[PDB]
Amino acid sequence: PTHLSVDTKFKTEGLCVDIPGIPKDMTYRRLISMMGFKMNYQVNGYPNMFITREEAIRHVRAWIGFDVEGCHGTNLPLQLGFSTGVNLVAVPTPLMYKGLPWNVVRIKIVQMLSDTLKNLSDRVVFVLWAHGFELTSMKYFVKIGPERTCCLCDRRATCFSTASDTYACWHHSIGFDYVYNPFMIDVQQWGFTGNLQSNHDLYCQVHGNAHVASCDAIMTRCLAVHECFVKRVDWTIEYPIIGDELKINAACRKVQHMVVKAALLADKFPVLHDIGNPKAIKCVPQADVEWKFYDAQPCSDKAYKIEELFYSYHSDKFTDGVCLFWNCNVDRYPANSIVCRFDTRVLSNLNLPGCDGGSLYVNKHAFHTPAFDKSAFVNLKQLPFFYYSDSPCESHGIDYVPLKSATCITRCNLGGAVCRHHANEYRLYLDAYNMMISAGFSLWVYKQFDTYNLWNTFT
Numbered sequence: 001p002t003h004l005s006v007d008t009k010f011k012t013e014g015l016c017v018d019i020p021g022i023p024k025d026m027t028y029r030r031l032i033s034m035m036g037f038k039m040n041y042q043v044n045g046y047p048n049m050f051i052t053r054e055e056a057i058r059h060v061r062a063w064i065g066f067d068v069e070g071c072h073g074t075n076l077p078l079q080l081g082f083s084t085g086v087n088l089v090a091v092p093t094p095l096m097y098k099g100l101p102w103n104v105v106r107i108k109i110v111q112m113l114s115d116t117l118k119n120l121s122d123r124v125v126f127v128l129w130a131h132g133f134e135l136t137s138m139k140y141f142v143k144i145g146p147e148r149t150c151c152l153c154d155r156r157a158t159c160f161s162t163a164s165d166t167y168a169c170w171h172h173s174i175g176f177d178y179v180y181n182p183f184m185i186d187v188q189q190w191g192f193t194g195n196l197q198s199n200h201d202l203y204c205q206v207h208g209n210a211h212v213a214s215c216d217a218i219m220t221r222c223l224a225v226h227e228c229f230v231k232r233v234d235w236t237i238e239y240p241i242i243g244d245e246l247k248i249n250a251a252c253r254k255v256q257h258m259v260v261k262a263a264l265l266a267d268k269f270p271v272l273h274d275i276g277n278p279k280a281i282k283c284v285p286q287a288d289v290e291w292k293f294y295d296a297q298p299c300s301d302k303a304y305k306i307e308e309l310f311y312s313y314h315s316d317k318f319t320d321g322v323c324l325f326w327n328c329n330v331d332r333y334p335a336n337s338i339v340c341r342f343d344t345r346v347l348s349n350l351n352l353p354g355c356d357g358g359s360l361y362v363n364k365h366a367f368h369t370p371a372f373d374k375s376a377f378v379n380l381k382q383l384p385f386f387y388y389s390d391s392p393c394e395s396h397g398i399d400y401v402p403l404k405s406a407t408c409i410t411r412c413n414l415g416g417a418v419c420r421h422h423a424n425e426y427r428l429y430l431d432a433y434n435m436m437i438s439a440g441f442s443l444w445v446y447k448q449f450d451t452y453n454l455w456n457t458f459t
């Protein structure tokens, strides 16, 4: 069981207002045929236009909510809405475009999908709350056939051109007019009671209904993300490398070690309470502090309430020493904390829009993160940049310009002049730091944290 069988039944109740008289007994095979597509008994990598929930979860980066509303159906204009916020009007002759024929609407669809998806995925997955018009509109902008490769590269083809009779991926499709071998999934097949808005609004207050096709397209994809990543979590699913994943994860490990060591030394805490991942390792192994771990998986729905993490009777005294919350999202951090909190608002190829202000951060695994909330950090302050090192000043083994910086906390800078080794290490650490910040991570620390206390650790 790899793909969705075309002989699987498809519930047609949601389709009968736009398509009256539709048979209750229906397969994907018959539905695809009714949509104007012929699969010709083809065993060439595209067995079904529709896919399973498990296949959709593996391809979450390709998700594009799609809805079609009858503006007035052969004789009436259609409003095509996409979870990108785009609304196109197709005439049969929050962005709102005026009525145009399909031959130009399809050019716009290919440009919009290519620009949104070229740095996310090798395909498109149309996420539907199917009522009929969206399925019957597909023949006007979609072509299907055997799996193909791009004419300019080795990537799979996602677009087709009638002008040149050629195929292209999302990177090489400028001037292409047809979406080729798209995938799709009808959320209404998952077993829901009531309409789209009533199921969406149960879990999300961020997406409203301005009564346009893009609002429904947005709500549909949000509801699909809630079902697949919020109420259901699967951290075994691996996702391909599409950007700076490796550099970001390595930077996160460097910054954590740097900041936690410096806190321990500067304030000499006797105990550290490490709250978060149950598979966490001591980030400063050569530490003399009493290191105590507390297990909490990444919260994907709402941030943990500090009252439930800490209270109901462990050291018991979380007020003793320091608390380390490294990607452990809580509602209000205690004053004696060191915190790394992912900012869901960040724009990047790793961060996809999520449910109720949250975001879906996809880096090796998929992690739905509750909305970033500035009030969580009232007891703390922003952690400023600094580099600390007690390692020997020794080059060993890239050209040089001398480093001058008030934030290079080293014996050499204390002594008046930064050595080559510590300048190279400072510059590498500043690059790792900037990578992690730009990726969306934000750092917070207890108000008494002062790097001035690190200079006396050189005596």
Ligand SMILES: CN(CCc1ccccn1)C(=O)c1ccccc1
Residues within 6 Å of the ligand: 261, 264, 265, 268, 269, 270, 284, 286, 287, 288, 289, 290
């Ligand atoms: C300084 N602290 C805090 C606990 C402490 C406080 C006072 C004396 C000893 N240990 C460390 O755990 C530590 C970190 C990095 C290197 C070496 C020791």
Ligand SMILES: [Zn+2]
Residues within 6 Å of the ligand: 150, 151, 152, 153, 154, 155, 168, 169, 170, 171, 172
């Ligand atoms: Zn290509």
Ligand SMILES: [Zn+2]
Residues within 6 Å of the ligand: 200, 204, 205, 206, 207, 218, 219, 222, 223, 354, 355, 356
């Ligand atoms: Zn929503």
Ligand SMILES: [Zn+2]
Residues within 6 Å of the ligand: 392, 393, 394, 410, 411, 412, 413, 418, 419, 420, 421, 422
């Ligand atoms: Zn040095």
